[PDB]
């Protein structure tokens, strides 16, 4: 291979992109480019980034000391207080560890699902003018260069204007 | 300075859910968790690229 690859997901993720999470890139005779999808990215970032705050719920219960640091305590009641503290501490440690590990599973699963839905929405738009390429990638069978490309990203792609041309080359 | 919970060696003024400074606190301190660190994800699965030269 002389030039670099162009393939999308199902193979690997984009390395050189900083604008937004979800995006896509094209290729044709005119050149090559990149662009990010903002409406999808804004929805995703807003729902995932705020998870940190939702963990710290403001149940404003106030606690007070029961253990004297400069201590002169008995030995029985001291043992009773010691036992409960470790049991509750283990409950919090066990509860907290599973909660975070449990929520990470949803974030990875949810984000992967939002990506697929966007991929689904493009196949419906192209309808019969494009054939799936099996690497999370599409093959357009009619000639767009720069603005016909921009329409696909913008939901204004009226397939009816190109169907008579695109369908004449998928099956010769 | 302002704060709302304290411990032996100072103050734990912060805005995070869990703390690992001391098991004993007074006031509205965060819950004590007995672990060094507990990372929380804020992204998606990573899949770096490979080199093609064939």
């Amino acid at each position: 291979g002389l030039f670099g690859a162009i393939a999308g997901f199902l193979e690997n993720g984009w390395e050189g992109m900083v604008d937004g999470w979800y995006g896509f890139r094209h290729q044709n005779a005119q050149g090559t480019g990149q662009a990010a999808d903002y409406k999808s990215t804004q929805a995703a970032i807003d729902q995932i980034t705020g998870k940190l705050n939702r963990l710290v719920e403001k149940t404003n219960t106030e606690f007070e000391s029961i253990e004297s640091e400069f201590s002169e305590i008995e030995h029985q009641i001291g043992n009773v207080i010691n036992w409960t503290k470790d049991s509750i501490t283990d409950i919090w440690t066990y509860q907290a560890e599973l909660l975070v590990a449990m929520e990470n599973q949803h974030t990875i699963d949810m984000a992967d699902s939002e990506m697929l839905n966007l991929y689904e929405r493009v196949r419906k738009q192209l309808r019969q003018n494009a054939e799936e390429d099996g690497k999370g990638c599409f093959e357009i069978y009619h000639a767009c260069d720069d603005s016909c490309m921009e329409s696909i990203r913008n939901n204004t792609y009226d397939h009816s204007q190109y169907r008579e041309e695109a369908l004449l080359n998928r099956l010769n | 300075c302002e704060s709302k919970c304290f411990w032996r060696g100072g103050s734990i003024n912060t805005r995070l859910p869990f703390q690992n400074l001391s098991p004993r606190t007074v006031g509205q301190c965060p819950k004590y968790v007995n672990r060094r660190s507990l990372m929380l994800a804020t992204g998606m699965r990573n899949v770096p690229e490979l080199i093609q030269g064939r």
Partner: antibody
Amino acid sequence: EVQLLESGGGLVQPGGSLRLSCVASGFTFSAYAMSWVRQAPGKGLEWVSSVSGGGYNTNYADSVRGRFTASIDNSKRTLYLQMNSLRAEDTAVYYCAKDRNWDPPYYFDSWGQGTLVTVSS
Amino acid sequence: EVVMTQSPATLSVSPGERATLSCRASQSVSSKLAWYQQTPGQAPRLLIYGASTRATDIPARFSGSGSGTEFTLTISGLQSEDFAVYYCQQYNNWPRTFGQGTKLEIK
């Protein structure tokens, strides 16, 4: 971790030209853009060229448009610059640097050691 | 085509004192600006991107702010080896022009 290395400096006279080369390793060579930069003796920096999108796109500064041609070979991870029609005004040190974006170069991040190019009568 | 000016063209500061620099623009850039460091007989080094974000391996004494057309960069404590030539560059429009440059020296 990251390493860029270059070579090809030497004397030249009008009409002739050099062919600089800069090698890259330690990072995926097909996932970032590359650029050249020069600095005249004791003067300010200037942009000369860059390559985008794996090699299908190129751009040049207005001072060397048509004269200098850039290219890329992603099998050997090598960066080229075929200069032509030198006028001795470009005598300066050259560098090859790596940026952090794919289609637009954005801002250059890492640099190498560079090389010296000079012209004389 | 952006053309930028760095003021003053040269500055001098004593060791251990605060140092501040600025770079001005001809038309709005909106945080699409960067800064560099370079010593003579060497290669440059990238310092700040996004006009407010430090790049990797940039000590805590480097910071700055700016928006629209004017930017500020203060080195909080000038150590024995912080003296070098600095540059401001914009990546908003072609060509990504550099400018006059600036040399920092011991007073």
